[PDB]
Design the sequence.
């Protein structure tokens, strides 16, 4: 019948203090960057970002192959607000 399911999530960050609470970490082996050191209550968390989320794009652009210096610069230049497409890990195995 009708096809078309949802995948990733669209979150809009808002620069508040000392920049974005969350940070980036270059992982040797996988492309793009990853979210790490995301404080609870900041712009990232509020938007729904975790320390396992990855940055697929930024401002309507696939920055997967792009290095960590390129992706970061894009988020830094953006200014206060910046968009990022996250898709992948969500949370580890939990009981309750």
Sequence:
């Amino acid at each position: 019948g009708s096809s078309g399911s949802s995948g990733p999530k669209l979150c809009r960050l808002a620069k508040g203090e000392n920049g974005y609470g969350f940070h980036l970490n270059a992982i040797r082996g996988l492309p793009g960057s990853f979210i790490k050191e995301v404080q609870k209550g900041g712009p990232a968390d509020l938007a729904g970002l975790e320390d396992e989320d990855v940055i697929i794009e930024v401002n309507g652009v696939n920055v997967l192959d792009e290095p960590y210096e390129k992706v970061v610069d894009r988020i830094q230049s953006s200014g206060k607000n910046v968009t990022l497409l996250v898709c992948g890990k969500k949370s580890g195995p939990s009981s309750g």
Remarks:
- The two ends are 37 Å apart (CA to CA).
